[PDB]
Design an enzyme around this catalytic site. Structure first.
Site, PDB file in Angstrom:
ATOM      1  N   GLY A  22       0.873  -1.250   0.054  1.00 60.39           N
ATOM      2  CA  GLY A  22       0.162  -0.184  -0.122  1.00 60.39           C
ATOM      3  C   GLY A  22       0.883   1.054  -0.047  1.00 60.39           C
ATOM      4  O   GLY A  22       1.769   1.277   0.700  1.00 60.39           O
ATOM      5  N   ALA A  23       0.196   2.366  -0.444  1.00 55.13           N
ATOM      6  CA  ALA A  23       0.620   3.652  -0.466  1.00 55.13           C
ATOM      7  C   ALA A  23      -0.346   4.858  -0.152  1.00 55.13           C
ATOM      8  O   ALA A  23      -1.265   4.718  -1.030  1.00 55.13           O
ATOM      9  CB  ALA A  23       1.631   3.862  -1.883  1.00 55.13           C
ATOM     10  N   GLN A  25      -1.227   8.865   1.896  1.00 58.26           N
ATOM     11  CA  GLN A  25      -0.764  10.114   2.059  1.00 58.26           C
ATOM     12  C   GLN A  25       0.313  10.299   3.241  1.00 58.26           C
ATOM     13  O   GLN A  25       1.488  11.008   3.000  1.00 58.26           O
ATOM     14  CB  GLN A  25      -1.692  11.145   2.661  1.00 58.26           C
ATOM     15  N   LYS A  43       5.728  -0.729   7.704  1.00 58.27           N
ATOM     16  CA  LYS A  43       5.236   0.464   7.637  1.00 58.27           C
ATOM     17  C   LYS A  43       6.189   1.672   7.449  1.00 58.27           C
ATOM     18  O   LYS A  43       6.965   1.896   8.418  1.00 58.27           O
ATOM     19  CB  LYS A  43       4.122   0.801   8.501  1.00 58.27           C
ATOM     20  N   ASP A 134     -11.362   2.133  16.609  1.00 56.99           N
ATOM     21  CA  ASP A 134     -11.245   1.884  15.102  1.00 56.99           C
ATOM     22  C   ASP A 134     -11.655   0.317  14.894  1.00 56.99           C
ATOM     23  O   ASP A 134     -10.805   0.019  13.907  1.00 56.99           O
ATOM     24  CB  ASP A 134     -10.100   2.265  14.540  1.00 56.99           C
TER      25      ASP A 134
HETATM   26  C1  LIG Z   1      -2.522  -6.352  -1.040  1.00 56.73           C
HETATM   27  O1  LIG Z   1      -3.486  -6.823  -0.194  1.00 56.73           O
HETATM   28  C2  LIG Z   1      -2.802  -7.665   0.734  1.00 56.73           C
HETATM   29  C3  LIG Z   1      -2.514  -7.144   2.190  1.00 56.73           C
HETATM   30  C4  LIG Z   1      -1.875  -8.150   3.211  1.00 56.73           C
HETATM   31  N1  LIG Z   1      -1.681  -7.868   4.481  1.00 56.73           N
HETATM   32  C5  LIG Z   1      -2.078  -6.443   4.938  1.00 56.73           C
HETATM   33  N2  LIG Z   1      -2.840  -5.675   4.024  1.00 56.73           N
HETATM   34  C6  LIG Z   1      -2.992  -4.230   4.581  1.00 56.73           C
HETATM   35  N3  LIG Z   1      -3.637  -3.482   3.807  1.00 56.73           N
HETATM   36  C7  LIG Z   1      -3.384  -2.719   2.853  1.00 56.73           C
HETATM   37  C8  LIG Z   1      -3.711  -1.133   3.160  1.00 56.73           C
HETATM   38  C9  LIG Z   1      -1.941  -2.935   2.360  1.00 56.73           C
HETATM   39  C10 LIG Z   1      -4.346  -2.998   1.424  1.00 56.73           C
HETATM   40  N4  LIG Z   1      -4.119  -2.078   0.533  1.00 56.73           N
HETATM   41  N5  LIG Z   1      -2.197  -3.853   5.658  1.00 56.73           N
HETATM   42  C11 LIG Z   1      -2.398  -2.433   6.233  1.00 56.73           C
HETATM   43  N6  LIG Z   1      -1.431  -2.533   7.090  1.00 56.73           N
HETATM   44  N7  LIG Z   1      -1.065  -3.731   7.330  1.00 56.73           N
HETATM   45  C12 LIG Z   1      -1.477  -4.355   6.283  1.00 56.73           C
HETATM   46  C13 LIG Z   1      -1.092  -5.890   6.122  1.00 56.73           C
HETATM   47  C14 LIG Z   1      -0.386  -6.874   6.695  1.00 56.73           C
HETATM   48  N8  LIG Z   1       0.151  -6.250   7.834  1.00 56.73           N
HETATM   49  O2  LIG Z   1      -0.204  -7.993   6.388  1.00 56.73           O
HETATM   50  C15 LIG Z   1      -1.418  -9.558   2.760  1.00 56.73           C
HETATM   51  C16 LIG Z   1      -1.596  -9.721   1.386  1.00 56.73           C
HETATM   52  O3  LIG Z   1      -1.167 -11.009   0.995  1.00 56.73           O
HETATM   53  C17 LIG Z   1      -0.447 -11.138  -0.445  1.00 56.73           C
HETATM   54  C18 LIG Z   1      -2.169  -8.861   0.316  1.00 56.73           C
END
Ligand SMILES: COc1cc(Nc2nc(NC(C)(C)CN)n3cnnc3c2C(N)=O)cc(OC)c1
Length: 271
Positions: A22-23, A25, A43, A134
């Site tokens: 993720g990306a 702000q 992060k 949250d």
């Molecule tokens: C692209 O979506 C995924 C997210 C995560 N896991 C996570 N997802 C998000 N959500 C996002 C924001 C990355 C989806 N866009 N996070 C957010 N903060 N931590 C996380 C996290 C993690 N700690 O594993 C694991 C994954 O397996 C290939 C795929």
């Protein structure tokens, strides 16, 4: 403890960002490896986007909340760019997992199972005297073995005198947030319980937006009348009445998270 003494401080070289998840702000979220083999989540704060103290306050909070049902702080890198390294959850956020072919095939048995793991996570928070503020399908992560954990402790707070009162002009997601928190900015563990109620609608509907076909004001307008969310499509009536307990008008009348766990476990085995 200062960084050269903090057991959570690692030198940046041990890390290796491999895939960007993720990306936004305020920074980015990567999948990486610590010391070659251990898969982790990283992060990074976007320099200048926000206070490094504010960014780091989250990790500092996670040092205090360690449990199997809570996403676990792995380490930090306190030089810029600042990193907050945490436990990796293979199946991402719940709200997303429920929409995958795998998630779609899950029976009500397993849906209730998961609901009980989240509540158990909140029971630990409950007793340790923390609030989450949250709680929502988006902020629950899922493991490769289909177990769930509480994540994102950015808004989380420690409590002495019952409740934490937020800033004057701070706004929260209306659908997921208890009235007293929206109206008065007063948060208690009972504010979290209400969110859990919304969370159950997210689980049972596979990540659908609560209060279908309704704007925030329509939502605020219905609640004040005595209404609660219309029975979601295909939802065990037992589970729905549990939703209602979470949605009682007075906070003190809503159930504990410990009671909720217990109740959901009985729902789980009886199926
Ligand atoms: C692209 O979506 C995924 C997210 C995560 N896991 C996570 N997802 C998000 N959500 C996002 C924001 C990355 C989806 N866009 N996070 C957010 N903060 N931590 C996380 C996290 C993690 N700690 O594993 C694991 C994954 O397996 C290939 C795929």
């Amino acid at each position: 403890k200062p960084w050269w003494e903090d057991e959570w401080e690692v030198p940046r070289e041990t890390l290796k960002l491999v895939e960007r998840l993720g990306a936004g702000q305020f920074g980015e979220v990567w999948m990486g490896y610590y010391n070659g083999h251990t898969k982790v989540a990283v992060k990074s704060l976007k320099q200048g986007s926000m206070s490094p103290d504010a960014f780091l306050a989250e990790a500092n909070l996670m040092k205090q909340l360690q449990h199997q049902r809570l996403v676990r702080l792995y380490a930090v890198v306190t030089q810029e760019p600042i990193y907050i390294i945490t436990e990796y959850m293979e199946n991402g956020s719940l709200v997303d997992f429920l929409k995958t072919p795998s998630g779609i095939k899950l029976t009500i048995n397993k849906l209730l199972d998961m609901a009980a793991q989240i509540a158990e996570g909140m029971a630990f928070i409950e007793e340790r005297n923390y609030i989450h503020r949250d709680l929502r399908a988006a902020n629950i992560l899922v493991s490769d073995t289909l177990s769930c954990k509480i994540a994102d402790f950015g808004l989380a707070r420690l409590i002495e005198d019952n409740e934490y009162t937020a800033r004057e002009g701070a706004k929260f997601p209306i659908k997921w947030t208890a009235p007293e928190a929206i109206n008065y900015g007063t948060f208690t563990i009972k504010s979290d319980v209400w969110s859990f109620g919304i969370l159950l609608t997210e689980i049972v509907t596979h990540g659908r937006i609560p209060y279908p076909g309704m704007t925030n004001p329509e939502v605020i307008q219905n609640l004040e009348r005595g209404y609660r969310m219309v029975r979601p499509d295909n939802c065990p009536e037992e589970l729905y009445q549990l939703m209602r307990l979470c949605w009682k008008e007075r906070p003190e009348d809503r159930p504990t998270f410990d009671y909720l766990r217990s109740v959901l476990e009985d729902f789980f085995t009886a199926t």
